Design a protein around this ligand. Structure first.
Ligand SMILES: *[C@](O)(C(=O)NCc1ccccc1)[C@H](C[C@@H]1CCNC1=O)NC(=O)[C@H](CC1CC1)n1cccc(NC(=O)OC(C)(C)C)c1=O
Ligand SMILES: *[C@](O)(C(=O)NCc1ccccc1)[C@H](C[C@@H]1CCNC1=O)NC(=O)[C@H](CC1CC1)n1cccc(NC(=O)OC(C)(C)C)c1=O
Lengths: 306, 306
């Protein structure tokens, strides 16, 4: 009973957070086995930030220019290397708290938990979606760079995001753990714009299934729709096209509720055309799009992790 | 920048969660030093739930009846005791991961993080407010009882909630860690209902201040109101009366923004009377009341825990 935006338990990732300082800049790093991963702009001064030549700047650095602290312990840096927009600092000690992990690049519409960290110390946890303009709607202040986003499957932590920068109107951009940016962005202090954002249709449909599962049924109508006719309306309201893959992905939820996917699309189509008429769904007065189909199943069926 | 509903990092609590089985009932317990805390109804059959005589039921229980697992390590129960609605199981092994902790009874209007667990394994984290009707808007399934709510101050975990039950409005009720229910609820299978609930006015104001700090400022206006006139309008909408102590508690956010509380109240009065005209505030189309002034200050100033 109840439906909440829910993050993964963050303990397995808390144990990996360290502090990385280079010269005047302190941010967070991720300590896995004997490697610390952090944003490469830790080597920049405020002047460098406006147009940095990272390869040239890094040649000027040595292992001892990197001060890495895990709580009250300094880790010795014995090697360093750049991979795209992240640095990899080899350290002489392996992290005893390293969880089972992998690095993944997620797709737009997929969600993950962010452990917001400052000076190597975890501060809070919240859920984010990779939007189709490759931004996230985060909560990030000075010092949060190097905080990571992740999912947990059983005991395995999949790291998918490392935080680098803020974009206009309070949204955020970063890389995967191989240092490749999500979206057309670059780690440079210059004006950069994100593309127009859109609503994540398959996620709205998942959340409408969550609503039915939790006893909110008032938006269900007696119609069905074809995929084409639905998308004609969806595009008029800045919704992402719904694909047959999306329909197929919603299958398990539609079996759980006895409401065919294209029937739910006909109810969504009516909501888009007529609005919500001042009524709420799952305690929201708008249509929510940052719950994936899996998020809904996971929460409504009690999947756990250890 | 950016403002998100944010839970505390949960790892300090994850290291305390265990599974407690008694007969056919399995739920979660909280393992601190050599004591495991869990809901006393773990000793009940469904037949016991109608009017359980907990004192008599417990007398018939052996230490051997209590099967406690921490991961795949069984803990030997060597003693048990009842305190109000919580059972205290003394175990052979003190929890090596016991954090610095306190037991506190939170006040209505205040927030805390819930670590939802099943079979002693953490599954997710989210923020809840203790409502004025002594319920919380949680997400809890079969097997979640014994999950706890907490705040973290520096390195001290203040445990304030243990989950016991769901109500016929989709909300939840439980105890403090001394086993005393919040609200008038009882741990037996009887018809129970949440009282009327009021909107937490001081929290709505704090969230409007959060909005301004993050640059979402369209609802600000040049008008001011008296405290009494604001409360005349507020009371009609089932908002909690705003006291002078509330105005004082908002002092830090008022000073940060330069917007006097009675100036902000004129925004809130206009939003109550005329609605939002299809705009959002921090991404919400309704007025959010589950952020405390401290939650806003904590998030917008970036304080950290360890
Ligand atoms: C990250 O570097 C960080 O946390 N660094 C440690 C630190 C920084 C400053 C002071 C003390 C310690 C920050 C994270 C930012 C901060 C505010 N919100 C965030 O998400 N990243 C940057 O500052 C980033 C670095 C560039 C990519 C390499 N940066 C620099 C300068 C400007 C912006 N953004 C910005 O100005 O956006 C607009 C829309 C123009 C306001 C930026 O992200
Ligand atoms: C908690 O006891 C628990 O999780 N126990 C272990 C377990 C239970 C069931 C199956 C396997 C394992 C549950 C938590 C509830 C369950 C679903 N969501 C929750 O939040 N608590 C209860 O069942 C509670 C126990 C009473 C306090 C001692 N209980 C009993 C009887 C009735 C209700 N409520 C209820 O019927 O609510 C409605 C909305 C009317 C369905 C109740 O919580």
């Amino acid at each position: 009973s109840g439906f909440r935006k829910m993050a993964f338990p963050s303990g397995k990732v808390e144990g990996c957070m360290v502090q990385v300082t280079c010269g005047t800049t302190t941010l967070n790093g991720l300590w896995l086995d004997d490697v610390v991963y952090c944003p490469r702009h830790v080597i920049c001064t405020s002047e460098d930030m406006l147009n940095p030549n990272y390869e040239d700047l890094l040649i000027r650095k040595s292992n001892h220019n990197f001060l890495v602290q895990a709580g009250n312990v300094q880790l010795r840096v014995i090697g360093h290397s750049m991979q795209n927009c992240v640095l990899k600092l080899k350290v002489d000690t392996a992290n005893p708290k390293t969880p089972k992990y992998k690095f993944v690049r997620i797709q737009p519409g997929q969600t993950f938990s962010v452990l917001a960290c400052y000076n190597g110390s975890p501060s809070g946890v919240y859920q984010c979606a990779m939007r189709h303009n490759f931004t996230i709607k985060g909560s990030f202040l000075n010092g949060s760079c190097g905080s990571v986003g992740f999912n947990i499957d059983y005991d395995c932590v999949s790291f998918c995001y490392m935080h680098h920068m803020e974009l206009p109107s309070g949204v955020h951009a970063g890389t995967d753990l191989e240092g490749n940016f999500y979206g057309p962005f670059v780690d440079r202090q210059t004006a950069q714009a994100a593309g127009t954002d859109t609503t994540i249709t398959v996620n709205v449909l998942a959340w409408l299934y969550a609503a039915v599962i939790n006893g909110d049924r008032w938006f269900l109508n007696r119609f069905t729709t074809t995929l084409n006719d639905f998308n004609l309306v969806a595009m008029k309201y800045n919704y992402e096209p719904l694909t047959q893959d999306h329909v197929d992905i919603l299958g398990p939820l539609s079996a759980q509720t006895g409401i065919a996917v294209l029937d739910m699309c006909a109810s969504l189509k009516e909501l888009l055309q007529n609005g919500m008429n001042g009524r709420t769904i799952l305690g929201s007065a708008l249509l929510e799009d940052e719950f994936t189909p899996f998020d809904v199943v996971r929460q409504c069926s009690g999947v756990t992790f250890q």
